[PDB]
Design a protein around this ligand. Structure first.
Ligand SMILES: O=C1[C@@H]2CCC[C@H]([C@@H](CO)CN1Cc1ccccn1)N2S(=O)(=O)c1cc(Cl)cc(Cl)c1
Length: 128
């Protein structure tokens, strides 16, 4: 399925080239611009664990997830991955635990040493 495909065929987008964050662009976005550090970004997403279970979805809340990029408000894989996205892009992101919740996990939903899969749509980004 999609998690296997990003694992096997995704691009390593880490600066360290440690295959900790892998990406496939699923829907090509607009032009060339990507958000910059500190921008307010609006996304829709769904996340899955490696046992196949969906653990979260913004779509199901009927409102986007909003954060300021590059500030550690989200897991490292998201600061790295969303920074690569164009407006309107949809991507798949595979996040090894070192770029997510590590050995601690995040109870109740995220176990220890969890590789996470996301589908992310970048709706908008704006400077404040
Ligand atoms: O960094 C995150 C990432 C990436 C952005 C989208 C979500 C948000 C909103 O739930 C949570 N965070 C930040 C965060 C804040 C507080 C505790 C743990 N993580 N998550 S997430 O991995 O989907 C997530 C979803 C759910 Cl339901 C619980 C947890 Cl612990 C994590």
């Amino acid at each position: 399925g999609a998690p296997a495909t990003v694992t096997e065929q995704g691009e390593d987008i880490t600066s360290k080239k440690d295959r900790g964050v892998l990406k496939i662009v699923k829907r090509v976005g607009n032009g060339e611009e990507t958000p910059m550090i500190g921008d307010k970004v609006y996304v829709h997403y769904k996340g899955k664990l490696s046992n196949g279970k969906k653990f979260d979805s913004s779509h199901d809340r009927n409102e986007p997830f909003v954060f300021s990029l590059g500030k550690g408000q989200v897991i490292k894989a998201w600061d790295i991955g969303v920074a690569t996205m164009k407006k309107g892009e949809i991507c798949h992101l595979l996040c090894k635990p070192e770029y997510a919740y590590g050995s601690a996990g995040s109870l109740p939903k995220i176990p220890s040493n969890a590789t996470l899969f996301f589908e992310i749509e970048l709706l908008d980004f704006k400077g404040e």
